[PDB]
Symmetry: C2
Subunit: 114 residues, 2 copies
């Protein structure tokens, strides 16, 4: 029985995650073993993994899809941090509002909300 | 504010996930769309993502870390499926037993308990 699935992003300096996952996405550090750092949300979700031929609407497949509960807030934080947005925001036909942007490690992040 | 973190694996054919995520890990299709297919478990944890200089014990950083309740059963399933194990099983210093293997898409998967 699968309890959690966690993506691991390779970096010589895990502290580089703080600016995006910590500050913008509001995920405090949950575990810090030095060679690995985990950022986590106060919430609480089924273990899942997705397999995709495109990101939808003809986009590239994002490395991670991160669902947030106040999209307009996250959007404003991203803008205030001066981060370029690669796609969106746009409301998709399948009933999400989302944008793509790059994280500190060049991963393509899909930030979405119901 | 973050409700979920889900990795997406790029593939021309999502159906190829069933052999590993479905048949070995016991995560059935929760959603099929079918440009995208999500496999899911009935268990929950905090949404999280990790950032690592190495996989631990000098290993490569695994693409995914997947925590399972019944390590010995998964290990047996893996072997019976004829899948090569790249690392382990071994019990690590940070209180886990784990092994690494490749998924259908070439991703390095850390299965741990
Ligand atoms: Zn990299």
């Amino acid at each position: 029985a699968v309890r959690r699935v966690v993506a691991n992003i390779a970096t010589p300096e895990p502290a580089r995650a703080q600016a995006f996952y910590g500050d913008i996405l509001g995920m405090p550090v949950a575990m810090d073993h030095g060679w690995i750092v985990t950022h986590a949300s106060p919430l609480e979700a089924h273990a899942q993994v997705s397999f995709a031929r495109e990101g939808g609407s003809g986009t590239d497949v994002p490395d991670l899809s991160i669902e947030v509960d106040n999209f307009d807030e996250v959007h404003a934080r991203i803008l205030k941090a001066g981060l370029p947005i690669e796609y969106g925001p746009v409301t998709e036909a399948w009933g999400v509002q989302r944008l793509f942007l790059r994280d500190p490690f060049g991963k393509l992040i899909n930030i979405l909300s119901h």
